[PDB]
Amino acid sequence: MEMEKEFEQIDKSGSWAAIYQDIRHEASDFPSRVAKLPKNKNRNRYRDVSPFDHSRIKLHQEDNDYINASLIKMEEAQRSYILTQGPLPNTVGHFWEMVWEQKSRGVVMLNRVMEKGSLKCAQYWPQKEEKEMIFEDTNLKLTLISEDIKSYYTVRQLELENLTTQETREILHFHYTTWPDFGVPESPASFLNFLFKVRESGSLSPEHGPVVVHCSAGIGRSGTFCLADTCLLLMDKRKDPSSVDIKKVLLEMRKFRMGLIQTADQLRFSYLAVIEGAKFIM
Numbered sequence: 001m002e003m004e005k006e007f008e009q010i011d012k013s014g015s016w017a018a019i020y021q022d023i024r025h026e027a028s029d030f031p032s033r034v035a036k037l038p039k040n041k042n043r044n045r046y047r048d049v050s051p052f053d054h055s056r057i058k059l060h061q062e063d064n065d066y067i068n069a070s071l072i073k074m075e076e077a078q079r080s081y082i083l084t085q086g087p088l089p090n091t092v093g094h095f096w097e098m099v100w101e102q103k104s105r106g107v108v109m110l111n112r113v114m115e116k117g118s119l120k121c122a123q124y125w126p127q128k129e130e131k132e133m134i135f136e137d138t139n140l141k142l143t144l145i146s147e148d149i150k151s152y153y154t155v156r157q158l159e160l161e162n163l164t165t166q167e168t169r170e171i172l173h174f175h176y177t178t179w180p181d182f183g184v185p186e187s188p189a190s191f192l193n194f195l196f197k198v199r200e201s202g203s204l205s206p207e208h209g210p211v212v213v214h215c216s217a218g219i220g221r222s223g224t225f226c227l228a229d230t231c232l233l234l235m236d237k238r239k240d241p242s243s244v245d246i247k248k249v250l251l252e253m254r255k256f257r258m259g260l261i262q263t264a265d266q267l268r269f270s271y272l273a274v275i276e277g278a279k280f281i282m
């Protein structure tokens, strides 16, 4: 079926939970043996969210190459994304090592450091220009260059230096600051505006490594971001845009990381975002 009328048909029939459970039943199951090794317990935020072995990002390190991060490679759309958990106190250095080694330009953050009164990720970037951060375990230096605070999101320019080679690179930090503590946003308008700002920066383009996107577990809000982006790109590429099937795209993405889209409300919000976004593109 088309999207916008399939949408109204699920609303009127109140069957979002059944649709979402079907997706959970059909989703791929691949091994995640490296994630479960005892030496990696303090590298995982949640025991039930792990990268598959076949798509995990490997650190270029002979001691321990593990990070909780997955490469989502979308062949028809010609887009790739790295989805990862919010960094932990003992993985901030690994996080920036990955950004460096994978040649990423942008980092997309969809959570606040504290939500619901608890810490959802480490404070992993510097908050003042004159107070830079040094990650001694991976030999990197990170400096805040500039910060632009808007009503729904903040953009930061960062400098990452590999202290071993003295090479430097500019990284863009795109921080969506207004996702509500419970539920999903009432309108997709600010989320779509944010997606377009990431696009306009070059951070999603083939001349760079894959964008790094995270929330707390790296599957819920993060899944919504890449699912909406990929669906809108396919609607531009194809002769028949109504042939884009959001449930099939989501199942394809779940071949690369488990659990993408965590609730039936997030599924409905993804439909809403793609529907409204397809009108603005034209």
Ligand SMILES: CC[C@H](C)c1ccc(NS(C)(=O)=O)cc1
Pocket: 146, 147, 148, 155, 156, 157, 172, 200, 201, 202
């Ligand atoms: C950190 C704010 C600074 C003013 C800034 C730099 C870059 C961009 N975007 S871009 C994609 O490079 O055009 C936006 C803002």
